């Protein structure tokens, strides 16, 4: 376990390899740079990925750059955090929340 977490900006092109085929659960943050609530959660996700990096991986999907993946998962409010396991969404958190609330929402993945 480490003091920093990993981060990868995933694309329409990389989504299968990076997310849908991952061993760990992957929290995909569907965001945009003009979204204040997305900016708000970014330190929380950073802290979470460091704290629980043995359990979960955090990646970001910019919806301006990657439409498509957004539209595939019906993402029309941001931030939306989808956690993927086995190539499908297992948990969805829609809208910005405090760190402690995100961690509760992630309990089934990061309690182990």
Instruction: List the catalytic residues.
Output: 35, 38
d(C-alpha 71, C-alpha 49), whole Å: 26
d(C-alpha 38, C-alpha 49), whole Å: 16
Instruction: Phi first, then psi: give them for residue 104, nearest 5 degrees.
Output: -60, -45
Instruction: Phi first, then psi: give them for residue 83, nearest 5 degrees.
Output: -100, 125
């Amino acid at each position: 376990s480490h003091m920093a977490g990993t981060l990868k900006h995933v694309t329409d092109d990389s989504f299968e390899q990076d997310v849908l085929k991952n061993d760990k659960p992957v929290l995909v943050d569907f965001w945009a740079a003009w979204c204040g609530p997305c900016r708000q959660i970014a330190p929380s996700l950073e802290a979470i990925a460091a704290e629980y990096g043995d359990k979960i991986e955090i990646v970001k999907l910019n919806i301006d750059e990657n439409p498509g993946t957004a539209a595939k998962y019906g993402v029309m409010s941001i931030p939306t955090l989808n956690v993927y396991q086995g190539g499908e969404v297992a948990k969805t958190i829609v809208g910005a929340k405090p760190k402690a609330a995100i961690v509760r929402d992630l309990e089934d993945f990061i309690a182990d």
